[model samples]
Target: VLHDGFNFDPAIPKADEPLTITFKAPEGSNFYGYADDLYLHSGTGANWTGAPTWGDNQNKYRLKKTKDNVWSITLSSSIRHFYSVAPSTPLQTINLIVRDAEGSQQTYDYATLVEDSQNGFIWEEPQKAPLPISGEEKEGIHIHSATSIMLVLYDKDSQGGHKDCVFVTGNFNNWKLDSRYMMKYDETNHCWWITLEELTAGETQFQYFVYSASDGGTYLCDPYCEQALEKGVDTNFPTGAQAPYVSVVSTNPQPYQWSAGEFEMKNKENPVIYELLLRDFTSSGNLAGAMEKLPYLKELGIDAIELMPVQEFAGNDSWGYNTGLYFALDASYGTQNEYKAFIDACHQNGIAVIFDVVYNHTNNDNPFARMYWDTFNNRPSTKNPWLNAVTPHQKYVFSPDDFNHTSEQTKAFVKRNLKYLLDTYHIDGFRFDFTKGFTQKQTTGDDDLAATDPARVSVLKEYYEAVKAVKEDAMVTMQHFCANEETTLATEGIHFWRNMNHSYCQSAMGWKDNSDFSGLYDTTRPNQFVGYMESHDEERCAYKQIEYGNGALKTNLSERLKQLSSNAAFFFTVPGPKMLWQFGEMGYDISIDENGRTGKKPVLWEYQTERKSLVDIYTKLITLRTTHSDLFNASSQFTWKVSYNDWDNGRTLTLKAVNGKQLHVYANFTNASIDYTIPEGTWYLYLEGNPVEGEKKISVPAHEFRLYTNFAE
Candidate 1:
């Protein structure tokens, strides 16, 4: 009953003031071993020195035993103080030093130390400052430095002098609901603000408590944590090991050193994008793992590596589309520093990195959803500022709670995230998934919105404009499935994902069915689309060709490999930017739904070594596509000629640059070898590394493709 109470000579201590703090024993003694072993343990005094101290430091201040077994110590320091207690030696549950069986001296059990919580004295002159903003306080953790930390949360619905008390608690304060840390209401901004000074600076973790009569009580992770701890049961986050899934703000996190000092972007017109999901692309599924592969991608001739969503989500393993915290990096993929390093590495290698951000909707675990949730409807309340209470469109809704683009708050929230990702990570671009959902117009379960809705079009225009304002050179593309094609034509820098999967897959499968690829070249819009046969959301072209190949295609290993090569032939030959899913270059035959949709998959680095031929073809095609600027450059004028008889198993695409350089690509999809007429000119076989003059016949084997160019010079 003894070791608990304390009193300072001065009621409120000031900095640099000499003060005596007394630890009084209860009527009965309560020391672990003996009452005489007590000593004062300063965390480490700035002005402290002297004989062996109770702390790990040399200056251990021994307590003077006095009347009633009381212990007292006087200390003065110009700076702040953090002190505890230490015992003489190992004394069961309480010990200054415990000797292990192996004979190692261990520090005393931390739980036995005197808690500042009960020390009961506060430094009353700590500095305070309002947020830098003049308007609404941005909701989330705002870390100014090691000494200052601020937290804010907003509730516009509860702003009219409502008594909804908001409190913050975290690992910083032992997760206690202390009134001292209660957030004060600012009627001017309709927000709550709490500024904490002298926070161990770089080590505090916290959350918000919204208590009111109408909503009872609810705890939420900060809506804007830069990095958070994953606490879901499905994750590997052990209960005692972490803050238990609560959102944690890394205080004064160490800054990363960037090797790329002002890198420039290439492939503006014809980007060879490699779309990858980090969880499946890296062996360790982290930034470090991905960094190890940057050299490989650089050598592979890709200008950009589009990573699937890296935002903090509900679990350790996900495609990352289910974002819970928009600003935080998913802990599963490594820290923010590691991510920045990876970005730096990519830029150093001349590759622009694009992030696949899912702002269309957030998952159920998001704090914003819980902030103004309607428990009865299991959705965002009608008063919610960011998300809609009811979904607007069924076909476009990725989740029940879609973003309310009509609200200024929602727009500002997403805009803030946009600036944060680009400004902090130095990323080059974004590929927003399901961009067709940015509308308030209601529609039937179809392309009714795309069929007739200017509002939706204008909404996307605003988003694109906003993105441009942030990073003038940043690329913004979307998987606009049913967005009116005019949306791409209207937005200057925005590109649409041209999903030519079925057509290219059909042609590569040696099937005459659904193989018309006229759309690849028919688009009159310039630099408005990214053509691809496969992406993170689609089935691997190799898997599809093998499973549903035509009878004309031989069911053999050689032919299977040839089919993939043929698909690459037509895809990269088209006039637009292109995307290649990870491992597609080496014929990754695993289905997207092999285990389960959005589940983990193996990163087959062995394919690079084992499947050399498949990789060679991709290398050749990508090399031809990117290396020859005339073929895909923005300013180069061009003329295209195509002859395709899908039923006859023959197709030809010729791009003749007006500058006199020409590229000819021909594919033989028939069961047997076929002959085709060559143009009248001196042509060099690109992949074969052979030379030939035109006005001759060329034999292309079944399921094989041929590339010849006059641009060899």
Candidate 2:
């Protein structure tokens, strides 16, 4: 006795009338039940307020079998039917129920309001559009008049034929779905939009819910939201489907109050950037906490601060490279205003802020990834506008997924997010991660295309130009790990990461190996690369110096610190921008692999006081570089000669700088003291500020360096 459809006479019923519903099961439909195990679960109106077990429910609606394989439930006039069957026991929603041992189930698909609309549910269209009166139009929640906001959303290219519907859910509506907030599809503009008018201005929570047919009744968040509430706390995640995390929307959103009046960057040529990770930067592990140390950083004489990715990523604790939400600030670090305050504070202290952006790939939960995903394969579909079907180039491993840089749509999307960062936060520049992935051409040659492809040059230039269009002084640099003499170097004018971690760290370890310093001058163009002795990706240089050091430096801590100071003396004074990992100046010996590679490390502020001399060496070099900037300027001619060029034993590095004025530096990176021949002349010792003893041969102490100028002031 299989029944195909319902037998209600008027299809749509009134609350005043009684109703009878038939429940029928076939021989092998997997629905096993007895007459006494029958129950009708439903709420009276359009809300969820019902139970599974009939006797335990307010309606007390039960089924009686009229035949061997069929049953019927007669409801009194007091009951309005919108229900599913339940066997024996109770559970949540009642639409889906499970009974112990007997294995009976009730699914909600059959109880949908679509089949019975009048007494079931009423679908609401978006609010009516107001006739134009003279005003301005804005995208986000904007002040339409004295009160009220006009909300606009830009979403395009869904699967054909009604696969997605955008709805605006917010606190003003009691967090419930009402048809009044449904956005109207503007086919002309290729976006969904709705205007909210005549409302009081204040704080509220809201989100855009995208219902997609391809994903089986799942949800999505707006990609352009500037701030979002944490998942699980502010928004409930459904058990079986995707969750669109809600965002906080303010009716009268306040822009950050900036104190720095159009502050310009100190130096793009030789900026000494201190790489900072806020999570490991202080005890509070937040933006506000990092603000307290701005004066300390300024006093250390750094001109810029390279912050690790501040974009909202998944989880509470992270390195932030796994970017999940590109526009929103990570709630784990602090609120949006707190981050603005920190950036403002940096500017007030005369330090530029550079953000590390992971544009090479995004985290798994990105809304763009979910929009055009292949659910069965768990990867980007071929029809995805922004992502590649599969990773093409395999010279090295890339994570999450590779974006389709060849796609114009993808490039525009990247620029869109970057512009938002510039507008919302007054950031100075971006250090794009895995810049090698900016090309679509795969590597079949000796090295990766990121290094050799000519298209990469064009793609990067286009992106740089796009950024410059938004902010004129925007500093765009990349991790373009190509050889200095690569044929394409002469064609492009952009800053790349000059990697000398291995060479610098090897020299500090008191090894006779790695004596050559030609990598510092490898490029032909001035300030074309940002040189670093240690970065977040490399092992801490001091840790490497202490572990792998040989002869006299390995066993003794003081000797290793001096070796590190000597390495910085050469690294910072070189003719290019330089970067230092957090606590690198004071000899942070923690291994990069401590605990886990990306895990949080302990913050040690005590090192500044404990290792006073090591910090002084870095500070002293910063002072000298800032004072005599023209000598170390990028365009100055660089020439260095090494004496006795055998390993690190009794070797000396003699450097000369000429801009019509003479400047010389004597450096000894050896286990023992050494002598270097010099021209006998009156010189102005930079440290002593007067002519020092100049002889035919000058004895430089091991792990020591000196700077002198022949032209007197």
Candidate 3:
């Protein structure tokens, strides 16, 4: 029963001959036993021309069951008269698909070549041309002229096995498959290549159609493509296209010219970072819209802005964690040059841009996963070198497939992408997302096993080293929560994200339990932790304080706003890097789960007008941290002591620099007023701009904070 499943009498059917077509259902076939009646839904010509309406149940196209698992159909007249196609039309391949009565279950699309007495069997050229005559020899799109380009694809199957045929199809040929576009195999380089000629100028979208006898055909966007088009998401995509994504080959492209002069990074040791999602940062929801707010960010006094992933992902509306194309810019936000313009504007305004990259996993649309996929389990196959067949960790399974960082091919791909982002976008730093999943070690039920894996540390360190090799001063940060691993990585110049949302939110909600913020005093790793009270991943403190506050003091909007100001007093004054979610300063009260966790949220710019006092407090604190970096930086000659455990009465923090400059912060979290002791010296009120010498104790009202310093500007 080892059959090809399809056979025709005379081998190749002639235009004038009456052909006999037969189909034998294989074991475990989708149509076996389920489909009692089989019909030949076929058409003439290469493009399925003159095909009859599917699922019509017409008697002429019906098949007769000759056996339990076999069916046959014999045409009464010649092939030219049976289909009634025009004589002038060159009948090429018979495009067909076997289907049941309901058309729900059907076989894959197949093609059968047709033969004629006069013309014989028409054969197509296997390749368009020999290898390129002369150009830069690379494994990607290389434009030799406005009308010619060379494309080289290094397929892993070509190493030692039955190599799959690769064909290039795109807007040039209406995104259709043709024999003339078949690529030629280069044995010396072990790659499939083609030199396309007469291509139109400007951007030409294309994709490689990999065809194999067992797996059929699979369309994949180039992994090295600088830009890609997502079907049905990008505005310029063709209507109802079959391909999921198409890679771009731009000839005579307009390169972005950098207008800003040599811009040096500021506050390398302890940068005040601002994390914002570009989609929800402004109404326009694009890079250009974000560029319009640079002056405001400059005035806010942050050293760096950490943008969520801007790489091409699954859809237009997303948090961008589900990365699809790592090299291409997400067209939903704007063009590549627009992203460069935004980065340039940030640099011009004295702000560094840090990209939040997702290297742990990718969505199903990614070519890396789609190229060698497991159709039964819907994951990557074992043959895939870049992705793991099965994820090592059982927890935190965010995407469909996870990367195997141990593979040298994967390492080279990541390193090359890192260099490209640095050289192309002029990025100053990277905040790698989900560093806990970088290991290949399997974990049991306990999720804590992911934290202590040494393999994860090694993988991240390699990437950090690769990034530093390109740009020494570029920042490398991660969203890791393990203290032991973070301390180890901190010693090697890697920074970590310190989530203080729970403690800070509890304090703002007037709850003494779990409100201790003493972890901010990490003596060993001072400035290596980018501490944040509210990030994109956490619930907003303002929302929790108002909706789930402890008492009347916390429930009131004005009181909660004042408590946020008090929280900011201690958060920004500590000696470490700091971050704020978008609109956190103006008391953004929208719940993180408003629409969904990763869905779009309202951009409330009007909050600045309604709550100006909260914004002023944040601006002043950020200014103090940046303007007086010597006291806040870890390298500065300063010693600090804090009493944050006393939640009943109040909390106090004191910092004294080596240069005779003293700073003190006091806050009252309780409902009743409390008495706080001041240092015995002539101290100036930092906010009020007044000096007091004889005040031994000052009564701080409920939800109020004060800053006292001996050296006030």
Candidate 4:
């Protein structure tokens, strides 16, 4: 056994220093440095009988002994490292031995000098990041729920005789680099106290002064798990893949929840879901005001209410895409609990509440996501090649990475939040926002979010499954999407249909010199379509129709009657449930603005009281829609069509449906009186208040709609 250790340090390279080795004599050795034999092997002595000489670059070994003992080695650059070395080659174990002048010897294992290709901070034992400093560490003036944050820090060489510790203004507050938001040293839990915003906007970022998160020396702890670790990891993260760090804090305030089973949702029968933005639909511009009009909606036969995003946003004139809190309800429309009450109230009225979900971006207030995003892996660096794609839209620029679903972890976080919404509030379903931007590796210039990985689309499916898994009767739909191909029939289930073909309005009213029924002709449905004069997204139907009439819409008797006819024909037709915006039936003249943010004219409760005759037209039109089911049967297969296909002299025609000897439908989209041939039987005309299904070629009035049911199939 060898006993003495060797050392070599002070010897400087002389000129050609061509790889040399040196050894110092142990104390008490009486030998002079001169001729000596040295050997290297797998273990000690001659154990390595199969070691190879350095002849090839692939398995090249580099070694250098500067002085008596110390050695240095060279390795290939790890930058472009991919694939493997020679697959058949194995590594040789290492051992070193040195002989002294007195013929004595020293030996040791030389294996530690060879660096591992993929070696890193392996967790030899239990390991984690240190507990993050939490709580309000600044002045007492800072409140927890306050949106505006003031960050106040100065660094010094131990001003109070302390080691240099990182201090970032974190925990919900704006990620500041000041001591005012710094955490107090709590040795008891081994953490620092800091102020947090509590609400997550996915934008606020935190770091220790200007230190590089990638520097590897300035390590930090996980905010959620409070585990300590080396620097660079769990810092910044983009959405899509797994994240290094995330604050698994409860979104309790917003009341986001988990879900359970799939029940019977939507059927082949089209359910008329009425869409409305809470602020615009009522006078007070809140849930309270909308609650007042729920009865009116029920009277109009609306089965479901599709609400625009009610989550917290900066302003009231938004489509709710600048979502800050997925968990909290927008306080502008109503408090969190108040919104729940609104849903509860709607359920009480037999109307289900559909909430619009925003998984696109977050406010600049989320501490964990923002901070983690600021971490090296998520930062704008050479690593995250898909960084720019995660950037936010032009108008809003907080947590742009939140928009980046390139990372899987961030994607999962979003899906989890969605689960919270579906189960917690018993929300019916969702209308996803700005879905066009979800393309994968989008930073690579591929414009289609759904074109690349289809991960976001998959996330949508998982969320759908999660919701249906809980509430079997849950319903979901995407808004503003056009064309049949815009929808991907993921799994063919019962409730897979979207809004009916756009032609419902085009054919019924738009083609009939009616602007309100402009889109009734969309071809999603080969036969029937869902038509609307105006929804929150578009301008008021009446206002647009007035402009298209080659002039203005005056309050004349003829104009009023024509508007009523247009509204009735488009709003209450086949595929049924019609979506009437804020103010349509009452006859107002306010179209949506150039920005298209503000909704139509407010409730015309004032106009209704003043104009009795105009109100009568609306009352009669609504009654007509509800009384006759034929107005809803735009199906040609089941109902016989007696087409009066005339182009020149006849810009009007009467299409009737005959059931046995029953005159089921008598539709007249004509301008002036027209004598159209009907079956030799009694027809029913209900627009005039009663039924009249008798005779052929009845004179139908100009711009008037009539429904008749004949007892002939």
Candidate 5:
């Protein structure tokens, strides 16, 4: 579901923000068919009645001739005047519902729009530096601690004035209007207040919050007085100051006990990585069952046994992304104590266990969610700012659902969860899922809509620091599909923002753009990512994308498997932990999720049985990956290689180390035999268990890869 951009800018939009929606086809072609009539919706009410919020007075994107089957509709900001626009100040909720000529529909929950313009409004002190300047520079004091600060505002005179919003807001509240943990004034403060928790190891800069405060809730006082100015400045805000002065506090991580394992996860070594699921990586999918396999995994040459998410998801079928309890493990898998034992076992076997965690969103019916999530059973409770309704989508029906990432309680909850695994289980690291969908942004036509949000970024960074803060050597890796460019590894503030690089899987740009079959291994590039071919959520490499696509690849599988396995061999022979799908080795190409990768091939145990030869080949590939020195230690001059894209006829792509002193690798990307001159020396071919060819040149057969060289230069 492609969204019309997102609002990333926190600036309350003035009426002038333009709106636009860009639509793209499966590729750059319209032959796959096209869609039309996309309408926008808001409110809990049915069938939108207001003037079109998109398009020119009518929210519609008619199917005009497309250039590359890609088109965009621009909506004028003038539509705001027609949106019933709310009474006085308005916060709008909008979604896009589109139907193609075929009558199929796709709806995208954009964002819960709230525009409060500092429009021409004077500041309490026309002197304070205009908030933090945007563009490349970041604002606010950031803290990496997991603790939170509670702020309770009170009026000296009025008793029940406590519910009023005499408080703080913006990113501090997760932008949910209220949920950032601002609590009620117990008649003591005569005002209202909320707590700012789980702040990252950094500063957050913000202005103020002005909401409908019925009781003595603490109200906001903007500098130069805006939201409160209309109400006569109450003169009682933040010491009656027009703008509340900003301050900084540290909410550090609380100590937890977890034995760190003994191994070097950073440097690929005698490391063994075993894969598991709390539900069924074993005969019985439970933490306890997984624990029983620790000894077995260790023997399998696995250094770290990675487990599928054990988070508290609603059912066992789901792979833990739809989480409920941040600190609690799923009950179906067994109690938290059992998870501890699983971790203990992995460590006992000298194996590091990396847990998959989803701190992004939560279950739809989760008890802790607020009304803004639109699907939570409860609506009118104190909304936690950090948790949001995935507006525009059923990610939750009406609102977004989040776990109040900014709340101290939630932070501690998260910190505790991580600690539980790291301490109780003596696990090694964590793999965060959906690190992108966690925040919203405004990047396109509306400067306010971008999917990336600061608070979420803070939370992510906070989690990273929190993990390392507790376990100094603790490693934190993120699992994100990446957007547009498919790389968040470069996002600001993230030191280890390793993206899930897809190039290693198999470059779709054809074998021409791809010569480095190893890079195509889909998990070869090191230092910046976790290269993977397919995850539990995607089709296995062997699962041809052609069969699944109703498009162009519709009739091609000839060389797909060849490229797939060649890519796999290349990936294994390269650096970094080459992440494989659940049954990737034996080719289980199925993706359990509905909208998962198409053409999912079921796990074929026969690959190990009837297809024993193929299994042997793969076994040898892994062996070479683990045992070859020149393969892993060769420098850029020799470690990696690329092919003659015009691989129309197969040829040998070789990498020479030490200016020809050593031959690192020679691989065949096609099914035709080719030869290459090796370094001028005595070299050994480790992969094929053969002698180097021709003294100075090596001739390898078609569809084969060979690694040659003695450790000594």
Candidate 6:
């Protein structure tokens, strides 16, 4: 009864004969120890025809343990009746996988040929071919015609003796395994490739099934895929537990018809940027929905809008920092065409778009991280060329897998991705997130050594050069808080983020302890910093004022809003680029930690109606800066001075032009009225359009600001 690894009574049993199958579990199999209580999960034909639902452990399919590491199952009925095949149907192979009761682990798929009487089954041989020559072929999907498309994957296996092979599977062939779909190796190209024929004109969803002796099997989307669908998140995907990201390839893909004319980028030296998240910007949480509010941003005199990450991420609702795909647009927001339409509409309205990109790390779902993963340690393998097996530094680490910027392959990928964004989406600039982790130098703790690393500076300079090569005037900014490094980068025409959240929040909350705004002027390069009081990552100024404001400012909404007006008078008139979080103009008071740190917050469009004074003040401040940009230019040699450390009373800022023109700003931080001495000159209240002469001193009320200029309206 025993033959090879399988035993069967009546060796060449007919379709109508009763038979028994005995299986000896492989010692080093994936499910050897866990598969004590074995079950036969099987089917018939070339495409798993007439197969029962997977993970179904019925009583009839359970195998009886005959001895140690051995199990057998007897089918009293004939093969045709047991598999529910038609009477006249021909039987070629019985496909099966042995698993435990819970179906958590399983063996390699086995296809037993029904005509074999000596050998139990035949293990499929993996397809192999020589590596393609460097720079000989493309690295992504290439559509040739309606009937033909070429796919190429570049992977160099380092595990000796265990060659790797790739096979494309998708809706074109019912996601099945077949030899015809196997890719061939090309020495000239140095890559694995296959030219698919008879492809339809529309989109085809597929994924590459990689098989190797060391890694067994892995399903991964194309590294250069432009679109992908995720399971349990995307609605279009079928319901199943075994689903992976399905990459899409469109033959004869239609291009988006752009309607906007040639656009001129706004001045980076002085811009009023508005940073917003699409998920919380509107209730609908889509690109089209955010497009409807473009007029609102334009009305606020915004020169640029910085959008949070819109690339494919780990889930539908997130801050989008956990990037999964670099090229594909997250379908949760909208389609590729819809994203193009949004950018086009912004260009038409004279608004530049800045994308917040996360190059520091990617989520585990990224194929570059999964292809050569270290399963035992749950990190990238040392053989991975793109990502580092371990983060070099301990400070400010956000994601598990850190990108190895030192690798030439990684650098090439970064440049290509940036170029693609510029050429395809017409993006105006980029704001790199968490640039402190761009180095490979190891550190013990959150030490200041990370601030002065020369390696980090070199990496940023390279990226800056690459971006400028594509778009000469494109803005390159980073969220780097180190002063020394920031100043060094600024000299190279780079910009940095200046977070004054704590300072501005303290001033708005009626506290004089940390209300110093003098640091906004501590820059040598013109427009070197994008100053902001509140960003997506910081606590809202209004929220802090309402929740922790001293005196009556905490309970009085009107007074709290008036304090914001005072803050804006000093913020926007400062003489450099400035930014505001969404709804900061309307005194948005919702806590950032309302639901969770990165959770969605309720959209309060009605705040505009409830707090019109704050909105009006913000609008006027922006107008004053935009209309008189020369007076606020940091590159100007004109003298300017600030006195912001006087916490007991008030603060003042004075700007004097060489043309005998002058502007003065004063604000009262105290709860009671305070007398402030004015300079010896004829001045007019710029906001009220009134003249004040022969007045050396004026008593300003609490929570108020004054803007005095020598020029008349």
lDDT of 1 by residue, 602-712 (tens): 678898887778888887788776667777654445344323455454677777675777788777767788888887888888787578879898677888877788845
Residues 1-713 of candidate 4 have per-residue lDDT tens digits of: 11223221212111111212233334443322333333322221112323433232232232344444333332223111211223222211122333332324433222111112232211111122334333422211222343332232211111122112334433443332333444444333333334455445433433332121121112122222211111223343322111122222232235423223332222213445666777667678788989988887666555578887876554445656666445556556765567767777776666677787766555433322332222212333223222332453343334454455655445554565666677667777776665544434424332332343455555555656766675666665544232332444223221222332232233223243222222333334422233455566555445544554322233343544463554454344434334455455555446567435443345556655554444565555454444544533444223323123431122322333333322243344444465655555565554443545355566655445455544322
lDDT for each residue of candidate 6 in 114-192, tens digit (9 for 90 to 100): 5322222223454555543235227777887986778887675333222256777777876654567878766444467
Runs in model 1 deviating more than 4 A are 1-138, 158-163, 233-245, 483-491, 552-554, 634-644, 647-649
What lDDT would candidate 1 get against the real structure?
Answer: 0.67
Judge candidate 5 against the unseen true structure and give its global Cα lDDT, from 0 to 1: 0.44
Q: What TM-score does prediction 5 earn?
A: 0.54
User: Taking the tens digit of each residue's C-alpha lDDT, what string does model 5 give over 139-252?
Assistant: 112232355544432222212221233235534543233333334444422324344665564434333333331211121322111011111212322221212222223344
In order of lDDT, best first, we have: 3, 6, 1, 2, 5, 4
* Model 1's TM-score against the true structure: 0.78
Q: How close is candidate 4 to the true structure, as a TM-score?
A: 0.55
Best by lDDT: 3
In candidate 4, what residue range of length 10 has the lowest lDDT sum?
8-17
lDDT of 2 by residue, 60-126 (tens): 4555667664556666642333343232211111121212223244423122222223323344443
**Residue pairs with backbone overlap in model 6:** 132-189, 132-190, 132-191, 133-188, 133-189, 133-190
RMSD of each: 14.3, 8.1, 4.7, 19.7, 17.0, 6.1
Give the runs in model 2 whose Cα sits over 4 Å from its true position: 1-120, 123-147, 158-164, 198-200, 232-244, 394-399, 442-448, 484-492, 642-646, 649-659, 688-690, 711-713
**Candidate 1 colliding pairs, count:** 5
Better of 3 and 5 by TM-score: 3
Judge candidate 6 against the unseen true structure and give its global Cα lDDT, from 0 to 1: 0.76
Candidate 5, RMSD to the unseen true structure: 17.0
Q: Model 6: which ten-residue window has the lowest total lDDT? A: 115-124
Model 6: CA > 4 A from native: 1-137, 157-163, 187-190, 238-242, 448-451, 637-644, 658-660
